[PDB]
RNA sequence: AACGCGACGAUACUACCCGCACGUUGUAGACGUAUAAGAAUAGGCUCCGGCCUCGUAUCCUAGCAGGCGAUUCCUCCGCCGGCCUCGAAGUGGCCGUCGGUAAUUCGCGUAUUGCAAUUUAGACACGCGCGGGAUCAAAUCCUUUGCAGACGACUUAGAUGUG
């Protein structure tokens, strides 16, 4: 396109205060609808979340998993 | 990622003279002299051994490191040009109207001129002025063949492109009208 | 149609100015200049050869 | 094959390279942390040229033309001090152009009002001989 | 972020008649001061365990200082940050002199690269890589190279910002 | 022939009044002392005489030059600019005009 | 170090247009006279077509009813492009602002009054000290030539004449410096012993 | 109408200025460029046309011509101009 | 551009030019208002020895606001001329005359402005005075013209003439 040689009308970034109140009212209204919809919540919520676990690139995943495994065993025999 | 060091090498043959100022590279060879300014690229030039030129950049990004690959081949092309040269061979074909090609060398500006006549019978005379240092001859080895040679690959290749574009058919059928001037072979003079 | 500022028309005019109009106007200028040639030919400080000084501003007044 | 290149000759930050700080003190590079920082130590006996062992940013430092030849990487204060005295870093630094300029600055700052008058009077006598010599040539 | 020190915080649930001598939990917390250090202890404990501030008690707050703040070390930080999508694991490496220096760099780096905030980042593990060959990230790997030495091209000199006018054009070579 | 100077004072420039974004206060002025680039350097000049010397039309008591006397009170900002309090506020047409900073009352 | 001068002649070559203008504007309001030379060698950061795009958008803005009066008068000369930047940096609709502008002078090239004066430089506005090495930049002289400036070639020819005279002046200059060093060497062996260490001990 | 002649005001002068002389190169011989005359009127002529490709080729055409009285001009001075960044 | 600029012609008085005498004259603001290479910044300068972060550098810088007389010195500054050079909004160099001149060292003088009070001191422009040189002008109204015209404006012509 010949934008450099013949530029068109600029798109003003000067915010008008009419939009700003109108833009803030919608943000408030939209936030309220999320909270109301999350209250109806016809959807199952569990307790334990999916823990991604130790990353593979961690250089000491051997020692940490060995540490955790022996932590379980010693606690199990103590309890 | 800001790689600390990255380097490349350009081996030179025995019969060359690579004189490189700040970033102006001059390569003298048996065929002649080539020159080129590459101050637009941040590169550190050095001599690593007897006959290999080292170019390196410190603390650059992948864009800056990759730019060294372009510099290596450009200077290498100027090395080839002064040693072996470049040669482009063009063939012009026609169906009914034989294309007339005239090659002359003029004293002023010292440049070769290629004049094309009778392209699909047109009466216009198309004149293309070759880049300086580009020699054009009509070969007496194959019919309708034009040899284009010189020391600079860019000048030889661009001049060959100029001839091809000017003899381009217009408002006709590509599948039916096959006339034109096309690059046939590319290589070195030696 | 092709405009008066078309690239192709300028190229054709340039050839016409160089190959047809040029020689004719050059011959005309030679004859005219010859006629005006015919009509016209019909110490440094003390002589003026040393060109010296005859008889708002750019800098700030110090 | 003839190649002549005149591009640039930088000074490299390396283990053994002694660098000058803004304080006028010196410190030899012992370890390179990254491209913007190094670990240095100035064991000079001169209090003015001394620097505690620690991290120095390279923006705050200047590279001197002196390099301790075979300073080990990670060398502690005892090892660095042994190389500092053996190479004679203090003597070589005193011979550098940077130290001469710094010394010239220090003398000029300490000038008192009476000394400035003496400098002016003594310079005019020196200038008188300089002018007579320049007149001949 | 800020200036940080490692804090050893030991806290316990308030001893009741049924449960004397409670568990005495412990954490290591990076905080600018002791007031923030105790707050993070109870915020973390309120999530993990069921011990609250009202029924809690801080046993000790201690500063862990680095054993060798003059030895250059490579650190590996395993952290979790939550974004608009969810909670993500990432492992990153920092070449520094102290753990507090490594953690401060991490907060700056996560803010610069992912716009992550302090309230969004959980520091799961900071470890000294005891030897090379434990360095996985290429940016650290290049710094631990053999005989590392580099120039400093295009060094801009430091001119006083109040020295508006200079008689000579500066040089960027030393 | 002395061919020397007679300057016993440090040169300054009257920049502006002590002002906010909109409101300006003529009672206090801002002075740029030549060669003063930091607050430490400005501390030398606190309590020093500063005189604004200007020329008038009518000769009153043997001269056409009038003087407004003031003091350097405190540094302003971090760039060596100082604050000055005069007997009368400066004419406000003298923004960017020379002032004289005397070396007395001296303590060195 | 904040020195005051009669007039500071700034060599505009290699300077970023906006950063020079902000520094120039502050000096004018402080009461210092500024002369900027070689405005055609000024630099604007970014790519060239972005600078061209901005000026073409500037050409769009024109008064509808009568372009002769009131409308934005678009100046194509390189110095007036710099002057526009400085004017927007100065409250030119006040008596104080107009007085500040009277302390400013802008030129293409180096007019003969100023070709023999010392050209200062502003490090905070120098392109080589400010721009990242890979970034692009454009020259005000090139943009001016493409929007209607008629005197690019004439200014270029005068620079060639100016620098040819500068070459002769520098050859004379090197001769004097060579003679000064020789005279200094000859006098140093004849002035006095005792004076010599007195100067050296004082740093001179 | 045309906006290329928009300020339809009376001419500032009765004479009229050239406003552009043809571009000069040193290769051509020395010559003058302009001259003055006084408008006399109009008259009709018959021209033997020699326009190849026209309908009136090898035919007689009647055309209108204007006569300008041109007494010789007297050269009484010389002016020199220099190139400046301001024109 | 009716508040942008250049070249040229003739300028009566007033005072046009030159010299010095001052102004109870105006200045968005003297007080050493000192300082010319060009070009690159992943390079440059050189005396070709070497040198380059750094103008915190170079020059000038002493004397009743800067006296008088020496001792001693050919160093620096200024005015005039002659030869040239400077046109982008126009100057500097060389030579000669004359005047001044601590690089060294003295003798005489400073007081009383009374313990500080802008150390009234520069440049430009403007005006008033003398004494030397120089010049003796135009425009408008008016009558007229119609290449012009609402009115102004404009193209013309009015002094001896191709009126």
From TrEMBL, chain A:
Residues 1-57 are annotated as: Disordered. Residues 40-52 have a biased composition (Basic and acidic residues). It comes from the Eukaryota. It is found in: Nucleus. Residues 6-39 have a biased composition (Basic residues). This is Putative GTP binding protein. The lineage of its organism: Eukaryota, Fungi, Dikarya, Ascomycota, Pezizomycotina. The chain holds residues 2 to 80 of 558 of the full protein.
From TrEMBL, chain B:
Keywords: Ribonucleoprotein, Ribosomal protein. Residues 16-85, 97-180 form the Large ribosomal subunit protein uL6 alpha-beta domain. It comes from the Eukaryota. Pfam families: Ribosomal_L6. One of its GO terms (molecular function) is rRNA binding. GO terms for biological process: cytoplasmic translation. GO terms for cellular component: cytosolic large ribosomal subunit. Belongs to the universal ribosomal protein uL6 family. This is 60S ribosomal protein l9-like protein.
TrEMBL record, chain F:
GO terms for molecular function: structural constituent of ribosome. One of its GO terms (biological process) is translation. GO terms for cellular component: ribonucleoprotein complex; ribosome. Gene3D superfamilies: translation elongation factor selb, chain A, domain 4 (2.40.10.190). InterPro entries: Ribosomal_eL33 (IPR001780), Ribosomal_eL33_CS (IPR018266), Ribosomal_eL33_sf (IPR038661), Transl_B-barrel_sf (IPR009000). Keywords: Ribonucleoprotein, Ribosomal protein. The keyword Ribonucleoprotein applies. The keyword RNA-binding does not apply. It holds the Pfam family Ribosomal_L35Ae. Belongs to the eukaryotic ribosomal protein eL33 family. This is 60S ribosomal protein l33-like protein.
Automatic annotation (TrEMBL), chain H:
It comes from the Eukaryota. Belongs to the universal ribosomal protein uL3 family. This is Large ribosomal subunit protein uL3. It comes from Chaetomium thermophilum (strain DSM 1495 / CBS 144.50 / IMI 039719). The lineage of its organism: Eukaryota, Fungi, Dikarya, Ascomycota, Pezizomycotina. The chain holds residues 12 to 98 of 392 of the full protein.
